[PDB]
Structure formats: structure tokens, C-alpha cells
């Protein structure tokens, strides 16, 4: 609808440093946009503590049932729920393997931070989300990844929709306060062999790795190339 397109255009122009308040203000203004707007625009990631297993995990709509959220470690909801939504047994095994795989992925590329993977069944395959958050007094920063993958088993076809939110801020004598904030979304597609050679997690991992490397380079070019050249064109 037109109001949704206007909301999405506003989110393209309002300061990305305030994504959460922007969305909240839009939903206050036009409450009927809430569902479609929140499914179209990812929000900054939030961290919770799994006190059962002793591990941090990331929150999103995909691991939410009512007002509880499911830990990928304990596979339990917080606050506990009677019969919350849970992956099938087959997918839970894949989900455990994927969280361990992406912990290693995250360590190797991010050298810290937190990651969570949630999977769910679809009629002809399954889908999943891969979440990664890394944070940085006078030098701060935050990287948030949200990767949504759709898998259609036939061989398998993978569809990946990836959002990265990146912001950096410095406060220094020479340059004063410098703040760079932004959000970028990309998509890619791929058919793959599925075997002990390239199981689903390896196929998904390569897809996510390729996407993040590509997005990182684009962010590098825009943040530290394009806006720098614009600044110098102003004076």
C-alpha cells in the first residue's frame, strides 16, 4: 500500500542511528502498518542471557512466541511457555549443528560478539535466520547481521535475504564527533548439491560468508569512500 511505501521511504531518509525510534514513531502514527513494517525493516539486535545453559543469544521475531523467546542453546522459552513453537526434531539437530558452526564462523571473522541461529519447517524444505552482533567510550561501533535463508529441497535451492546495520562513532580533538550510521540489504540465490561433502549448513555458511564479505566491501566503499569524497566536495 501507499502508506507502507511512504513509511519505507521515510526509513530510507531518517537518521539510521535511530532506527528503533523511527519505527516506533511510524507505528504510533499509523498503527495498521505495524505488521507489514516490522516484517520489512529489521530492527537492531538485542541480547538475552540463557541462564539455564549459561550463554548469550539474540532476539528476533523468528524465535518469539507470544512474549517469550526461545534460546537456541537450551531450546526453551523465557519466560517458560506451556507449548511454545519449536522446530521439528530433524530440524533441531540441524539447528544445533548450525549454531555451533556459526559460533566458529563468528569467532574467525568477528573475533568476539554473539551469534544465534533459528530454523523452522516449511512445506517443501525449511527456513532459518542467522543473527550476528558485534560491539566496539569515545570510540564505539556496532555491527548487526540478519540473514534469512529459504531452502527448497528437490539438490536444493537456497534464497538468502541479508541485512547489515553498521554504525561507528569517534570523538577526537581534531575531527570532533564523527558518526557514520547505515543499513544495507541484499539478496542472492543458488542451487547446490546436498551430500556429506556439502550438507545444508556448509551450503548456507558459504552463502552467508559470501554475502557478508560482499556487503562489508560495499559498506567500506560507501562509508569511507563515497561520503568522504562528498565531504571534500562541500569545501
Amino acid at each position: 500500500d501507499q502508506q507502507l511505501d511512504c513509511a519505507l521511504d521515510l526509513m530510507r531518509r531518517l537518521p539510521p542511528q535511530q532506527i528503533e525510534k523511527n519505527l516506533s514513531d511510524l507505528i504510533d502514527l499509523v498503527p495498521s502498518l505495524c505488521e507489514d513494517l516490522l516484517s520489512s525493516v529489521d530492527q537492531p539486535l538485542k541480547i538475552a542471557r540463557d541462564k539455564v545453559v549459561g550463554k548469550d543469544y539474540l532476539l528476533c521475531d523468528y524465535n518469539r512466541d507470544g512474549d517469550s523467546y526461545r534460546s537456541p542453546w537450551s531450546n526453551k522459552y523465557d519466560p517458560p511457555l506451556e507449548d511454545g513453537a519449536m522446530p521439528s526434531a530433524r530440524l533441531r539437530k540441524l539447528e544445533v549443528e548450525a549454531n555451533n558452526a556459526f559460533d566458529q564462523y563468528r569467532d574467525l571473522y568477528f573475533e568476539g560478539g554473539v551469534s544465534s541461529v533459528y530454523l523452522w519447517d516449511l512445506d517443501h524444505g525449511f527456513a532459518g535466520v542467522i543473527l550476528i552482533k558485534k560491539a566496539g567510550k569515545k570510540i564505539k561501533g556496532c555491527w548487526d547481521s540478519i540473514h534469512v535463508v529459504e531452502v527448497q529441497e528437490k539438490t536444493a535451492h537456497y534464497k538468502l535475504t541479508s541485512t547489515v546495520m553498521l554504525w561507528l562513532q569517534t570523538n577526537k580533538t581534531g575531527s570532533g564527533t564523527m558518526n557514520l550510521g547505515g543499513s544495507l540489504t541484499r539478496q542472492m540465490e543458488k542451487d547446490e548439491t546436498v551430500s556429506d561433502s556439502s550438507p545444508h549448513i556448509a551450503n548456507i555458511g558459504r552463502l552467508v560468508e559470501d554475502m557478508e564479505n560482499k556487503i562489508r566491501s560495499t559498506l567500506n566503499e560507501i562509508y569511507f569512500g563515497k561520503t568522504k569524497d562528498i565531504v571534500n566536495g562541500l569545501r
Partner: peptide, 23 residues
């Protein structure tokens, strides 16, 4: 790799509740 062009998959089936922001 390209700009948004196709739909995201549906979320987990049988989920209860509306989408909301986390604070």
C-alpha cells in the same frame, strides 16, 4: 548478489502473537 527482488520466506508456523519492537 542484487537488491531486494523476491519475498522472504514465511516465519515459523503456529506462532502466537503480533510483531513488536524489543526494548
Amino acid at each position: 548478489a542484487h537488491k531486494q527482488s523476491f519475498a522472504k520466506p514465511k516465519g515459523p508456523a503456529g506462532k502466537r502473537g503480533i510483531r513488536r519492537l524489543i526494548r
